[PDB]
Assembly symmetry: none
Homo-oligomer: 125 residues x 12
Amino acid sequence: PNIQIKSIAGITEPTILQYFATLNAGEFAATAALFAVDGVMYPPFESGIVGPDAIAAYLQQEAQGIKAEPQQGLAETSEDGHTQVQVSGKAQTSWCGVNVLWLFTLNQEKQIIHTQIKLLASPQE
Amino acid sequence: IQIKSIAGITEPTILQYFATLNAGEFAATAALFAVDGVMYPPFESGIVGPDAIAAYLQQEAQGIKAEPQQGLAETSEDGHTQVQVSGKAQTSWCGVNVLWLFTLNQEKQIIHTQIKLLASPQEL
Amino acid sequence: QIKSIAGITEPTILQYFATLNAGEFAATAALFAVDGVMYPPFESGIVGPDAIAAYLQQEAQGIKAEPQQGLAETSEDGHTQVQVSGKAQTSWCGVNVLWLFTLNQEKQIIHTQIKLLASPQELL
Amino acid sequence: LPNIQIKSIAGITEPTILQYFATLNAGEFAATAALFAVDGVMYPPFESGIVGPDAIAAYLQQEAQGIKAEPQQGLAETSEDGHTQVQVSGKAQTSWCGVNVLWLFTLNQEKQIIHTQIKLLASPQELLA
Amino acid sequence: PNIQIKSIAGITEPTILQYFATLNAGEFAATAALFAVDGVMYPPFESGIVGPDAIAAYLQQEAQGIKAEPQQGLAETSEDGHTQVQVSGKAQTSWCGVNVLWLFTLNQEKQIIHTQIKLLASPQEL
Amino acid sequence: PNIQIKSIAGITEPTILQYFATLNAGEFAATAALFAVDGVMYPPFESGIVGPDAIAAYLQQEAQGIKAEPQQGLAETSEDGHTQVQVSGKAQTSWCGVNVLWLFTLNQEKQIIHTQIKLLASPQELLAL
Amino acid sequence: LPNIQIKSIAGITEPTILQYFATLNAGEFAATAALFAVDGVMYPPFESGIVGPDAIAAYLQQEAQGIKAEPQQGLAETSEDGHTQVQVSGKAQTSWCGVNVLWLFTLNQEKQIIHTQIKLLASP
Amino acid sequence: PNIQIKSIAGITEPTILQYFATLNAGEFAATAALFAVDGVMYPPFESGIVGPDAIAAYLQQEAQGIKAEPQQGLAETSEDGHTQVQVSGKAQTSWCGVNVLWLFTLNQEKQIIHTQIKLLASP
Amino acid sequence: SLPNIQIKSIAGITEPTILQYFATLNAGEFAATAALFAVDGVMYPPFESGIVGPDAIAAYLQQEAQGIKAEPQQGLAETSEDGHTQVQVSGKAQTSWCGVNVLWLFTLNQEKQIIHTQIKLLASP
Amino acid sequence: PNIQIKSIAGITEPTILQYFATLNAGEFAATAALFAVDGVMYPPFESGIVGPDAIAAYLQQEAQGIKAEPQQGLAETSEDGHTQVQVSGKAQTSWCGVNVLWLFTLNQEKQIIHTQIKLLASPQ
Amino acid sequence: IQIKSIAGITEPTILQYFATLNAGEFAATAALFAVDGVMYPPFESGIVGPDAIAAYLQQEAQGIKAEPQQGLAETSEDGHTQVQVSGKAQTSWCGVNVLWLFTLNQEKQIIHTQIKLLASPQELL
Amino acid sequence: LPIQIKSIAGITEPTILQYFATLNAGEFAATAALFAVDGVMYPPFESGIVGPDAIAAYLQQEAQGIKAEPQQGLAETSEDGHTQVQVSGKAQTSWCGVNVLWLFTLNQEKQIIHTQIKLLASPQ
């Protein structure tokens, strides 16, 4: 299946664009494949999910019907060769919509070692 | 906007090179290359770095649709990735069959890419 | 200096080819009537000199037309029909082309069209 | 990549003439020069007659930069010999100064500019004294 | 003489496997045999060599002591029943080794109609 | 043409034409190349030989004096896309000539998956009196 | 490269001024610009101030092409602070049209143009 | 009078272009004017010549026949606000041309403090 | 066929044994090449061990030097106190797939026989 | 300390003469200065030593009391503007002496990008 | 770190001349000369060939600091290069203003170099 | 400045191949240089010619336009260290050929001490 994604201001990291594109297409396999073997997805509020297999199972049930809408981002390369990425935008679900900051850390080979979402909103929690 | 899948190719950089080339994101395409990454177009000499590359693409690559059908990718001893991709290039005047070659570094940046036309006795 | 074309003396046509090869796309578009149409081979149909000049600025970079010969006819309405056959070489591919044109009474290009011929035609 | 805006000149449909203005406007001084016959002459308003396309492209390369011609309307005649006379009137602007202009052209049987001349037309000068 | 037949990732087309196998074992009459009667082998530098007989002579003198090491390749079937094959790898001669793209076009009967070698740039800075 | 791939009545599958031509020319690398990675040559009296490398090795030692003279063959296409081929003929070595049925099985890509030999009644078993 | 015509201007003997006109007329826009201080300002007519030689030279390259300055006369005075105030009057010709002009120049102790300004003499 | 000088690669310093242009057109008064009050001209071989009056004098009688043809030069500004200039080229006379290095040192105000010629030949 | 022998000029080199070394090499004629050596003359090819005597050398050149074209461009020659001649020649060795730049080293005895020759390639780390 | 600067037949490239003159004089800092910033001296048997600082370091401890005696050499200029130099002769250090081929490559600025040493003959 | 640039001078031989003299590398300086190259110092007669030149430099040029400020260069018809560099030379006993002249052959060896003293603080009373 | 000879069967002695290759090229100066200082060339019928200078001079006037075509030869080494060579073939001109036997005696340094030619034929 062919997938589409809106390009994200300040980001040309291909792993990051693919992460968003796959997610909005339902290809949770391709999304989880972007993680390294021991890569960790922390979603909002729930505990960390490890490895492509568990990650892709998590997405299959929970991440259906969410549309990620990243507007902008920044990427910096640390001393150890890892890449740190911040991306801001909106999530839209079938109930309501929120503002979101997505955090990624990629290895020397651009596999997602970990990613963490935080909502942009103050003690309504 | 517009990431077509390519049989046998799942490498995000490769899919996006063709995706961005199909839009007018010659800067987005260009950014996929390493700082000293080379783009040898067919018949011209090697164009070094994302800046030159995005310049080249802005004047010459307008109105071209790459239509990659299939590809294979292999990992060398040095960690580098070798990719071949085949398919069509449609221009306003004619459609040709094309082999795209790519070598990626350990960081998935295109170190070099080369195009070879598929066709026999065609002069200059 | 404006090369001749066997069988063709009609200035608008000589000027059409000469201006394209030298990349003078404003000159090329100026030959068209206000509502003149350039139908390139695979795409829509481009109206007016402003549009036409734009299109020629992006796609027709690197092109060389090589008309060999032509014919021309004058219709009952005062218009002039011109057929010019030859080769068009771009950085990808060279093709055998037949340019069709229709000038009005003032010798402005009302519309032009490009048609392909053959070359890879073995068959049994 | 220059934006190309092609005027459209009232009463003038002779393509060589529409090219002439189109070319000058966008800086294709080579194209402009191509429009002349081999021994064709361009008389700009103040200097002497410049001969042949090679010279004319030189002259236009250094002098005509930045210039915007704005031909408004025109007339044309076809002579007994097959030549075409053309008169086009309008404004020529520079970033320093704008005047009103009559461009004269003559074309040979082959629609090449044999000669073109510029004539300046009175602008707000008060002979009203 | 020890014969080492390597797989070629993505390539299972027997004529193509044979071409590489024969070259490496120095069976250049077998290599030539894979071509159509009017088949053309274009080496990288010299002009086109026509027919099995010429091809076999050429390989007898020039191709001695070469090792082709194809890595991977792709293929495509045209409408005319022909097969296009693109194979990429290294060719080593012990004086020098270069990276190469082999192109092949096979007719309906799997005979090589024409094959070309194209060199790929190696360390060539500025 | 000096270099020759002889036809075999009934047989147009090129893998098979090449199998016989290469055997007869001694080009055992070319022959072994026809087989898939895990292809098996079962010679008539010995156990199966697996993979091109082994098959070339075998043919280098045991098939040096050999002349296959295939006469005719047939082929069929199974449900799975494999091709079955039967080719009957004579095989002459320096020690003895026999009547032979060669069997082949080709994958979808026309590589030899397996081949077998089956001896046929010869001129002298036919002297059954 | 260019030959430099250091035209006399009645009333003006300051070389920076003579050279400002001379370099302009020879097409030497980088020479002209060099006459300014590092933070010197050229106020052309109608557009805003342009600061520094590089910027000035750049501006001159695109806009000043084709123009002959024809200064006729000028006057200079030295201020208490050691600066020099110069007015020069005359024409600026183009191939299409001539305007009368007043060039103003203030120079520093080191004969650099710290600023210049042009005023056209007319009233549109 | 209109004064002529073929441009000098790497030099835009006006006092320097004036010097050569005045020299060539014979205006030795104007040349001398470029010097500070105690400015020195060292011509080839002979001693210093101090101030405009002496310089003009000197130029009137010796320099009449010479076309200086400077081709290139360089200028840099020392810490003392002075400018140092090297200009190289040919000096033609009606009998013979030689290659020349001209040296100039300018004060803050761009007057020539001192200038020195040197021939490039080895007879 | 007796090969036609092409005695290409080599700028700076006039010693026939050296001009003929290349010329024979190019013609096949490896036996003629080998004859240029003294009885105990040594050919050190690149990477491999030294090879002694015309017999051994013609054997070696028969199997390895097939389809190589030496392309010597210039050279220099000096005569030592002992009457021997020291020659260096630089140039290209072309095969049908690739070329390298080459320095040939030669030492000739008083009788212009090659007592030893050594080749070195000019590239790589 | 007496310095002796021998001519090298066939070789007039100054960097190369300096390399040898310097080495034989104990001026390793100078020798090292001949190399580009990222230039490499490969000595025989050991691995490559990058940069002048390192190269001077190396030469200070290991290279004392070596006398290079180059005899003759050839040079070439490549398409890229680099120079390749091959120099042959003897290295002597009293206790034992060997025949040597020095190899050099210079950039467009005549700095040494890499130099290697190859030992030659006498063993058999 | 080594090899200072000189305004307007890109000729490596000249850069190397100054750098080497400043550090006491008279061997490196002398080596820039052609075999028959001449160093005319300002008061003495000309010194021929690298061996002599290094000798001269060993006993007269120790303690010198040359401070070239700028220079120019021209290529003559015969392919020779002509270089003029001006600046200061300070020794322990006194400083001077100097014009260094150089002539290079086609191969950028120094054929000859000459020193001209420029007028210093000499008041003309 | 390349010269060539067809391979001579049984001969690899380089002085001998050069003699023929120089001769056929017209390079009679080089042919003469193969002889020792007191080397003698006895041509057919005429008296012996001594030394390269005389030899080259002779060859300049008499050897013009003759192509030697040696087919086979033998070489032996005597007890004195000299080399005795016999070569047989044709000597052609554009009119008519004759069969020839060349004899050569070389010194230890492979210089031609003497050569003699004989016609093979019983006419005249």
